[PDB]
Amino acid sequence: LASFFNSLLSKKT
Amino acid sequence: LASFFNSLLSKKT
Amino acid sequence: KVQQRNLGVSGRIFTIESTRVRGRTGNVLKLKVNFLPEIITLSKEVRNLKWLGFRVPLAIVNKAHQANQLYPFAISLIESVRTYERTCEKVEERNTISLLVAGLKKEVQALIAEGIALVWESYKLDPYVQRLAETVFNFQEKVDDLLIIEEKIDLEVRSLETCMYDHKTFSEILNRVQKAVDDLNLHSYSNLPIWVNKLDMEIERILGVRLQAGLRAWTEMFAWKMVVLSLPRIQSQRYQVGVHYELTEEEKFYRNALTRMPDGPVALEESYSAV
Amino acid sequence: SVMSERVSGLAGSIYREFERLIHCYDEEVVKELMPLVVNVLENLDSVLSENQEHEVELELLREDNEQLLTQYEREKALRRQAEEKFIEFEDALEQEKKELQIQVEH
Amino acid sequence: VMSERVSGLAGSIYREFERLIHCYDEEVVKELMPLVVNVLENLDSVLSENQEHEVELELLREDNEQLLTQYEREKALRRQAEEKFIEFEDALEQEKKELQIQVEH
Amino acid sequence: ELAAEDEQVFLMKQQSLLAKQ
Amino acid sequence: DDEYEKLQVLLRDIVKRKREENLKMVWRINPAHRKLQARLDQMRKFRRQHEQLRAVIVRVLRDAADANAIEEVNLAYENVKEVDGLDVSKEGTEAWEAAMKRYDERIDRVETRITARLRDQLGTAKNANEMFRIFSRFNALFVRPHIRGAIREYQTQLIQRVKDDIESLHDKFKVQYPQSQACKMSHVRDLPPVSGSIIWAKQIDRQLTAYMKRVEDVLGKGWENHVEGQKLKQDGDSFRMKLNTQEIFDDWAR
C-alpha cells in the first residue's frame, strides 16, 4: 500500500 | 468532526 | 467370546485403514466409519437373548445400551460414506467429466475433513450428520443428472456426421446442444467455460469435416458455405447479464472452420479452381 | 492483509487529489502529508480485517449456543423419561414379588 | 465519542493542513475536506462497531462456556441414571426368578 | 478454475491428521 | 413436579440411612391432581385447534352455506361449552367424552360441507388466473389434512402452469439486455444503460419472487420439501444466484 504514492513521488527524481 | 477542520479553514478566511 | 473381545464405541467417528487391493500394486487406503458391525450384531443378540431368559452380564448390557444410543448417527454415516464412495467410483468411470464436478467434490471433501476431528461422544454430532447427508445426496443427484446430460450431449455431437447438410437441422442440433449447456449453467457446475471450449474445438473439427464434404460435393458458391459458417457458437456463461460488451464474429459463429480443414486449405483452392 | 474494494476506492480518490495538488503547485505539498495518510489507510484495512473475524466468530459461536440449549433440553427430557420408567417398573414388579412372597409363605 | 488514535492522527493531519494552508494559499485543501472527514469518520465508525462486537463477544463466550459445562454435567447424570436403572432391573429380576424356581420346588 | 485434489493423497493427509491428534 | 422430585430424593437418601429401623418399604403414590392435569391438557388440545379453525372461518369465509358453517361451528362450541368439563368425577368425564365426540362429528360434517363448497372450482373458474386468485383467497383452509388431500388433481395442473411460466421467463432471460428491446425502450425514455440493466434484472427477480409466492400459495406450507416443490425451489435459488446485480454495480463504480 505504501508503494503506490512512493512511486507517485519518484516520478521526477 | 466537521466543525474542527471547518474552524481550521474559516479561522482566517 | 464377547467378554474376551471387549467391544465398545469410542474415539473419533472416521477411520482410515489401508488394504492391499488386487489389481493394484500399491495399497489402496479407504475411509470407513468407526462402528464395527459386530457392535450392531451384539445389540441384536442382547435384544434377542434377554427375552429368552438367558442371563447376560451387566457390562454387555451397558455396551448394548451405549451402542443403541449411538446407532442412528452411525448408520447415517455408513450410508453417507458408501454413497460417496459409489459416486466417486461413478465419476472415476468417465474421466471426461472430472473437471465439471470439481466444486462439489471439493465441498464434500471439505465436509469430510472437518468431520474427521469429531469424537464419538461430542455434542456436535447431531447437525453434522444432517449437513453431511444433505450434501452427499445433493452431490450424488448432481452427478447422475450430469451423467444423463453428458450422454445426451455425446449422442447429439455424434449425430452431427449423420445429419444432412442444411442450415435448419444444423441450427436445431446446435440449439439443442446450447440448451443442454444452458441446463448445465443453471445448476452452476464448476469449470464450465473450459469444458465448453473443449467441446467447441471438437464440434468445430466436425463442422470442418462437414464443410469439406459440402465443398467437394459442390465440385452461388458463397451461399453454400454460409450454411456452416453462420451457425451460432456454443456460449458457456450466457446466463450473466449487464456487461455491455459485444462478442466478435469469431466467437459468435464458427468463422474459424476453414482453419480446421483436415486436408489443409487445398480443398478451398480446388473449389475456386472450377470457377 | 488483503485490501478491500472500498479502501482501494477511497485511496484512489486520495491519489487523484494528490496528483492534482502535485501538478497544481509543486512537489513540496505531498512530502509530509502522504506518510501521515498511508498509516491511517493501513489502519482502515486492519480494522476491517479484524471486524470480519469478529463477525465469523460471532456467527459460529452463536449457532453453537442454540445447538447447546436444545441439546441440553432434549437430554434433560430423556433423563426424565428414564426417571419415571424406573418408578413404574419398580413399584409394579415390587408388588408382584411381594404377592409371590406371601403366596410362597402360606 | 472520538477515539484517541484517530484523534492523534487527526492532530497530525491538522498540523500538516495548517502548514499547507499557511505556506501557499487557501485553495490547497478546498478539494481535500470532504474526502478526509469521510476517511476519519470511516475509521471512527468501524472502530466503534468493533467496540460493540467485542463486548457482545465476551458475553456470549462466557455463557457459552457455562452452557457447555452444565450440559456435560447433565450428560454425566443421564448416563449414571441409565446405569443405575439397568443394574436395578437385572438384580431384581434375578432374585425374582430365583424366587419362582423356589416356588417350583 | 477449480481443481479438487486426488482422493488418495487427500485422505492420506487426513490420515496424518487422524494420527497426530 | 420438580419440588416433588427433590423431596423424593430426600426420602430415598433417608430410607437408605434408616435400613435397620424399617422392614417394609414401598413407593406407591397416586396424586389426585394428575387427572385434573390431564383434563386441562385435553382442554388445551381442544381449544387450540378450535381457535385455529374458528379464527380462519370467521376471517376468510365472509350463500347460506357459509352462514350454516359458522352457525354449526358456534353450535359445536356451545354444545361443548354447556358441559362442565372441570369435573374430575366419572359422570362429568363421560359427559366430556360425549361432548368431544359430538364436537368431532359436527366439525367433520362442516369440513366435508366446505370441501363440497370448494369442489365447485372448475364449475366456477374457467381460467387459471381466477383459480389462482380463489386458491390464494382460501389458502388457510388447507392446513387441515383432509382438505389438503381433497385437492390433488388441481395442484398438478397448477404446478405445470407455473413451470411453463418459469420456463417462459427463462427464455426471456435467454436473450441479454443489449439485444433486448427493453434497452431500446429505456434509452428512448431517458434511462442510462447501466441503471436500465439494473432495473431490468430487478424486475425479472421480482417476477421470480412472485411466482415463488404463487407456488407457495398453491402447495400450502412446507412447499419446499414437496415432490414438485423441491425442483422448483432449487431452480429458483439457482436462478436468484444468477440474478444479483452487485458485480455490475461494482464495475460501474470502478
Author numbering:
A (entry chain F), B (entry chain E): 429 to 441
C (entry chain f): 705 to 923, 985 to 1040
D (entry chain C): 23 to 128
E (entry chain B): 24 to 128
F (entry chain j): 353 to 373
G (entry chain m): 424 to 485, 513 to 704
What text comes from the article?
Cytoplasmic dynein is a microtubule motor vital for cellular organization and division. It functions as a ~4 MDa complex containing its cofactor dynactin and a cargo-specific coiled-coil adaptor. Here, we determine the cryo-electron microscopy structure of dynein-dynactin on microtubules with LIS1 and the lysosomal adaptor JIP3.
In our structure, JIP3 residues 24-185, containing the RH1 domain and ~18 nm long LZI coiled coil, bind along the cleft between the dynein tails and dynactin. This was resolved in both DDJ1-185 and DDJ1-560 structures. The RH1 domain docks above the dynein-B1 tail and shows extra density consistent with two copies of DLIChelix, one on each side. Distance constraints make it likely that one DLIChelix comes from dynein-A and the other from dynein-B. The LZI coiled coil is sandwiched between the dynein-A2 and B1 tails. The interactions made by the RH1 domain and LZI are sufficient to promote dynein motility since the JIP31-185 construct only contains those regions and can activate dynein in motility assays. A JIP3 fragment containing just the RH1 domain and LZI coiled coil but lacking the Spindly motif is sufficient for activation.
